[PDB]
Amino acid sequence: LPHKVEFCKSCVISNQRPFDDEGICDACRVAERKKSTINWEERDRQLRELCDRFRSKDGSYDCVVPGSGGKDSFYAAHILKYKYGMNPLTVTWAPHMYTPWGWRNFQSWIHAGFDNHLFTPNGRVHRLLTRLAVENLFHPFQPFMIGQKAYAPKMALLHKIKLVVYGENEAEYGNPIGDESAKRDWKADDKSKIFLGGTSVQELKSDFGLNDNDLDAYLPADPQQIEEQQVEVHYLGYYLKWHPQSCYYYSVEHGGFEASPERTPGTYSKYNSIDDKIDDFHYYTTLTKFGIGRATYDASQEIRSGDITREEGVALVKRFDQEFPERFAEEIFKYLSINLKEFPIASQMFEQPIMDRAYFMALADTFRSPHLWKKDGWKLRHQVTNLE
């Protein structure tokens, strides 16, 4: 039985996303606590000492910066190279489907002065795992994120680079390192012990025509090798005050970063996560499953940053959160389609291998919980509201 929907009284987020005694999410408390307790000058000195520790004296890379060429990864790599005198190799786990602006931003990243190693996993395997994750979990990104989180550490192992810097805030407030990942390497020995897109590796090979090579790209970094090679993952948001709007204007100035030419569906923003077309369906699934769409996440980030008030947040959520993303829907349906030509085995496992709109909407219904949705000739039972 699911929890009754309550909204946080600082941001516009709900308790459904996968609160304290004043009804405030941990996220608002961490942001507000950081906006008093953090001395950014002494964090700047810690960054300069970390760079001194790792900076390469020869012509080798001293730094791995993962990212898609979005405003955050652009800021991270650009400030590490041209302000802290680092030599980052940039590395990209490929999106499902490049947006035009997303591809231009990836190129602008490279053309700001960076080598880039882009890994694009087997497109057939990726589509099958994405379709399975949509069918089983209504979570297209589930397999993708397993590969993404593994990629940068594995790339540091391959190029024998020790330092990995993510252009985002730390996972644990106060700690610039993350290290938990070892539990991913164990998850194994058995058939139905490991899972991918809500399907066991055993049944992927058994029934969907996959082999162990098709899954090599998704395996986590070997923790023995990580420890052995002294690979350290750092979060640049620990060391530098991370402000998305600042990263946008910085990336426009120094890189020619291009915002989405039109408003991102489901939200009001134009420069948050704009490289992957399937991003649209990701926020539709979370909306369907948890009653909170993309405008909720964007407005919550902007309320904590101090760029908007909770009242403007509530107005934006009300206007945009329930918008369906039509622009790429048809390409995405084709991407999710498991045809006989490309998938001689896997295609037969699906009742409707070729996805259309009606099938996707029917599938969405099966993830729409009646404690969040009531029909109107659908509508949220509970929308975020302004404070009393």
Place this chain on the structure above:
Amino acid sequence: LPHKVEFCKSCVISNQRPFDDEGICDACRVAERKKSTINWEERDRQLRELCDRFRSKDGSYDCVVPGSGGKDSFYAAHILKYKYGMNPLTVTWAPHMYTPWGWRNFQSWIHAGFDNHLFTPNGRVHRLLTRLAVENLFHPFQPFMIGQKAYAPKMALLHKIKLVVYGENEAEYGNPIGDDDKSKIFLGGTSVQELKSDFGLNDNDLDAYLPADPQQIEEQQVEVHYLGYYLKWHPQSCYYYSVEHGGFEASPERTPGTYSKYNSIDDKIDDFHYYTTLTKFGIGRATYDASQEIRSGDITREEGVALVKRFDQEFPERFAEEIFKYLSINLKEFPIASQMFEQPIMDRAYFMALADTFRSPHLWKKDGEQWKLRHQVTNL
């Protein structure tokens, strides 16, 4: 003093490209020798036990297939995986500038069932080295080719893969295998010493162009094989195969300087590459395409001659302006290197003037304001 231009009597190529006693290029004789002496069934058997030797059982990659997702690299990876039961990692040294169809073909490659590791070198460094190679050698691809040739062996070392298979004919006919003072080493006609000294580069900027460590190659038993040794390589076959199995997309329009639509269509700078070879050697893209098709038996020397006469001297206008911008070394992106150039921002007039400085009078004669070739290939 340069050699007087003679054309080969089998194909339509000249002796200027960087002949025997019947006036036949070595390339025509080697194609003739191959279409007689080669038992392709026995070459197929040799391929099957190259594959047996290297095939991986533990679900790791057992081979590296380099390429851009053009018809050849598509064929190589697709036939190795789906016919010879290999598990290739595909590997791409990025082009200067993706064509739209080129990028869609690279994606079609990945979506035919291949993991791909794409290396895109520092775009500023690449533009500066390409502009230098254009100024000094009239050879935009020179630094690109150094990096490209190094890439696949280095990738085999990184992923700890032993077998590298190029989707092309062998370099040496008959064998399928390939075998401190900064003012000594050169890149785009410029020494490493002067690149760092005067153009604002460091050792890291040039790391991507360094060759594979030969000690590491020998130690890890990395073998480069050429698939054209083992399989009868026919460009047009690779095209129709790649269309059938991958949705390979030809150029929507005829490639400038030639008649073809699916030979090397991924890099916009490919246009200027064939213009420079024409300017320096009197032979453009139609000469290379027609010569290949004459040896394959698909056209006669006379059709070749007609195609060279109509297409070889075409200037590639479609991407000219984007390429001039690509070669432009502005102050924002190159605060140091920009000042080294008399005209940092390239335009058409500067490119044409620079071309003139490479147009040798033993190959080109003026006719009013139109350059014409002193010697064009003839039917004979």
